[PDB]
Amino acid sequence: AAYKLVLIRHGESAWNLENRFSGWYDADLSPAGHEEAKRGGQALRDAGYEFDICFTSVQKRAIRTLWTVLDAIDQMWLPVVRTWRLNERHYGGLTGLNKAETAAKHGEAQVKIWRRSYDVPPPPMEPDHPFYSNISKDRRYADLTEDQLPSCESLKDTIARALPFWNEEIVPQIKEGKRVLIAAHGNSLRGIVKHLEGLSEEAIMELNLPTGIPIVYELDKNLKPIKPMQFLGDEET
Amino acid sequence: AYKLVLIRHGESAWNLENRFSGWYDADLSPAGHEEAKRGGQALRDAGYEFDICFTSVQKRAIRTLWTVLDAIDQMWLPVVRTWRLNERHYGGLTGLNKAETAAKHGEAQVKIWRRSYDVPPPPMEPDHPFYSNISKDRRYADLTEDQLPSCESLKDTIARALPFWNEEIVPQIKEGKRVLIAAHGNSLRGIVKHLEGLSEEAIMELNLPTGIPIVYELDKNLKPIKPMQFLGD
Ligand SMILES: Cc1ccc(S(=O)(=O)Nc2cc3c(c(O)c2O)C(=O)c2ccccc2C3=O)cc1
Ligand SMILES: [Cl-]
């Protein structure tokens, strides 16, 4: 096809192991999640992939995934662009809580409701929240307006703030002929995939992208996929 | 009262920093990487914050930067890479050790090269083991014919580094952005010579330490207000 686009979702974080809600909390990769990034990188290397520009979030689990991939394909010299708009979904007041704490405080019914909803956000991260200053006062978000910096996000919100970056910064690069690599998170990449494929809310909520696996799109000049997304790796993976 | 930080990368693999590594894309050795970690460590201990980073397109410099951002927990910073901050291109000498260089060219000519600001080594010819590896590398594909060197005098190196300094780095500093530059001995020589107004002789005698944060305090004219300070224990 005219264009080729590659996505990669970061693997396991240190908080995944604690089964806590990370969201915008900047958890690093676990050793195993770092190895996942190494395997992805290796798959891209074995297939001879070349990029011209890379996009990632401002969260280190994604950024470190990118670094690991560039290292494996010997393209550390590529231009890299970071943006909060590709950050994981903001889980608001749930941030820092584990599974038990969440069901204990809110009940199974309510957590099931948050889980299955496209457009209901979790509770806001208020100023007395233990990670409030850690996230909302981090200088990396200093250029954000009041309306841009979320206290919490529905999946709809996450996608809504990811897609402007896609349209305004990545899309022109692709049409300029640049080969793009995006290293980001489950839900921001869900935003990109929902847009590319014209998926429904129902469909996108049932889509779980695998972690650490290069995801390959073949796009026409209008950035319409010409075939289903392909996963890159050995046969078992 | 601007604050500027420079860092020169440490040891590269296979003793290449003692073999005119130049534009060959040598990685850090484990030890050069540990030097970078110590630098990062010192910057963290002093509570340094940056807003933007500049580096070359050579992986030993880039990995040095990565190691530093990792240690100071600022992996989210914007990073700009440029060939103009590359190491000096040592032409046909690239990859050769001291003995091989003297064997091939004689002590007289090597002494003349060591001491010249403006005499380049011989060009890297098609029979050099790194010729296609470097000249056909995709990262330089947009460089014009005159821009991609076959060899460089120190003068050449500085001449192509300073335009990036003036056009890209200077406006950031004047905006108050706190800049970190992770690069190479001779490109950082270019910057230091411009800042301090050094003579050719002085800049040729200046050997910046590796893996150590080098700190500048600049006035409203980007003129240093005191000598460079080294950061560490
Ligand atoms: C931190 C954490 C706790 C519990 C789980 S789970 O075993 O129940 N699997 C799981 C859970 C959720 C979710 C999920 O996809 C899932 O696989 C959600 O998407 C979700 C969205 C909004 C609020 C809560 C959830 C949610 O709890 C996963 C992660
Ligand atoms: Cl980077």
| Cβ of residue B57 closer than 8 Å to a chain A Cβ | yes
Contact criterion met (CB below 8 Å) for A39 and A8: no
**How far apart, in whole angstroms, are the C-alpha atoms of residue A105 and residue A107?**
6
Nearest residue CA, atom 9 of ligand 1?
Answer: A115
Ligand 1 contacts CB of residue A115 (under 6 A): yes
Identify the residue whose tokens are 């003349």. Answer: B112
A88 belongs to the catalytic site: yes
Residues 6+ apart with CB under 8 A from B69: B40, B53, B75, B77, B79
Strand partners, A82: A56
Q: Find the helix or strand (DSSP H, E) in which B8 lies.
A: strand B2-8
SS3 B194: helix
Residue among B9, B23, B65, B75 with most chain A CBs within 10 A, to mutate: B75
The chain B residue lying nearest A81, using CA atoms, is B78
Signed CA dihedral, B190, B196, B199, B204: sign only: negative
Smallest Cα–Cα separation from A155: which of A191, A195, A123, A103? Answer: A191
The backbone torsions φ and ψ at residue B36, rounded to the nearest 5 degrees and listed phi first, read -65, -40
Angstrom CA distances, B8 to A152, B63, B192, stand at 42, 11, 12
Place of tokens 């003129």: B223
A21 lines ligand 1 (CB under 6 A): yes
User: For the CA atoms of A102, A104, A109, A115, what is the dihedral angle to 10 degrees?
Assistant: 10
Contact A232, A44 (CB under 8 A): yes
Please report, in angstroms and rounded to a whole number, the separation of the first and last CA atoms in chain B.
24
Which residues of chain B neighbour A79 with C-beta distances below 8 Å?
80-81
* A64 interfacial to chain B (CB closer than 8 Å): yes
Residue nearest to atom 16 of ligand 1 (CA): A115
The secondary structure of residue A139, as a DSSP letter, is: G
DSSP string, B97-147: -HHHHHHHH-HHHHHHHHH-SS-------TTSTTHHHHHT-GGGTTS-TTT
| Residues pairing with B54 in the sheet | B80, B181
Chain A CB within 8 Å of residue B176 CB: no
Ramachandran bin of A209, using left for φ above 0, alpha for ψ from -120 to 50, beta for the remaining angles: beta
Structural contact between residues A161 and A86, judged by C-beta atoms closer than 8 angstroms: no
**Ligand 1 atom with least separation from CA of A208:** 15
Q: Return the residue matching tokens 């990565």.
A: B66
Beta bridge partners of B182: B7, B55
Output the six-digit token pair for B174. Answer: 């004047």
State in Å: Cα A133 to ligand 1 middle.
24
Q: In angstroms, rounded to a whole number, what is the distance separating the alpha carbons of residues A215 and A34? A: 17
Atom 8 (ligand 1): residue with closest C-alpha? A99
CA-CA distance, B213 to B10, in Å (whole number)? 12
Distance CA B68, CA B33 (A): 10
Nearest atom in ligand 1 to A19's CA: 1
Tell me the CA distances in angstroms from B60 to A181, B26, B189, one per residue in order. Answer: 22, 6, 17
Closest approach atom of ligand 1 to CA A102: 3
Contacts 24+ apart (CB under 8 A), A117-120: A117/A154, A117/A155, A118/A154, A118/A155, A118/A156, A118/A201, A118/A204, A118/A205, A119/A154, A119/A155, A119/A156, A119/A201, A120/A154
* Residue (of B200, B210, B208) closest to B228 by Cα position: B208
Q: What CA–CA distance (Å, rounded) separates B117 from A112?
A: 72
Cβ A114 under 6 angstroms from ligand 1: yes
Q: For residues A122 and A15, give the distance between their C-alpha atoms in angstroms, rounded to a whole number.
A: 19
Q: In what order do the strands lie in the sheet with B52-55?
A: B79-81, B52-55, B179-183, B2-8, B214-218, B229-230
Q: Which residues contact A211 (CB under 8 A, 6 or more apart)?
A: A9, A10, A11, A12, A33, A36
- The CATH fold assigned to A1-237 is Rossmann fold (3.40.50)
As given in the structure block, the two tokens for residue A47 are: 């297939």
Among B136, B158, B32, CA closest to B85: B158
Asked if residues A141 and A84 have their Cβ atoms less than 8 Å apart, the reply is: yes
Distance, CA of B65 to CA of B71 (rounded, Å): 10
Q: How far apart are the first and last CA of chain A?
A: 25
Candidate CATH numbers 3.40.50.1240, 3.40.50.1980, 3.40.50.620, 3.40.50.300; the one for domain B1-233:
3.40.50.1240
How close does chain B come to A139, measured CA to CA in Å? Answer: 10
Alpha-carbon distance of A105 to A101, in angstroms, equals 6
Question: Looking at this protein, which amino acid is placed at residue B147?
Answer: Q
**Which of A64, A76, A83 to mutate: most B Cβ within 10 Å?**
A76
Does residue B175 belong to the interface with chain A, where contact is any CB pair within 8 Å?
no
Residue A20: its H or E element: none
C-alpha dihedral (B65, B66, B71, B77), degrees to nearest 10: 90
Q: Which residues contact A77 (CB under 8 A, 6 or more apart)?
A: B57, B58, B59, B62, B81, B139
Q: Which amino acid is at A102?
A: T
| Run of H or E including A213 | none
Given an 8 Å threshold on Cβ–Cβ distance, is A77 in contact with B49? no
Backbone CA torsion sign across B182, B185, B190, B195: positive
The 8-class DSSP code of residue B94 comes to T
**C-alpha span between B71 and B75 (Å, rounded):** 9
- Distance (Å) from the alpha carbon of B225 to chain A's nearest alpha carbon: 28
Whose alpha carbon is nearest atom 17 of ligand 1? A115
* Binding site residue list of A: 9-16, 22-23, 61, 88-91, 99, 115-116, 186-187
| Interchain contact, A140 vs B76, CB within 8 Å | yes
Chain A: closest CA distance from residue B152 (Å): 21
> What are B204's two structure tokens?
């040729």
Q: Give the residue extent of every domain in chain A.
A: 1-237
CA distance B139 to B127: 21
Burial of B231 from C-beta contacts in 10 A (0-12 / 13-18 / 19+): middle
- Nearest-5° Cα angle at A124, A121 to A126: 175
Report the distance separating Cα B68 and Cα B13, nearest Å.
19
* A93's tokens: 């007041």
The answer to whether the annotation marks B115 as part of a ligand binding site is yes
- The owner of tokens 């850090």 is B28
CA of A77 to the centre of ligand 2 (A): 9
> How do strand A53-56 and strand A180-184 relate by DSSP bridges?
parallel
Breaks (C-N over 2.5 A) in chain A follow: none
Ligand 1 lined by A116 (C-beta under 6 Å): no
Taken as a whole, chain B contains a residue count of 233
- Is the CB of A122 within 6 Å of ligand 1? yes
Q: Can you tell me the distance from the alpha carbon of B182 to that of B5, in angstroms, rounded to the nearest whole number?
A: 9
For residue A111, the ligand closest to its alpha carbon is 1
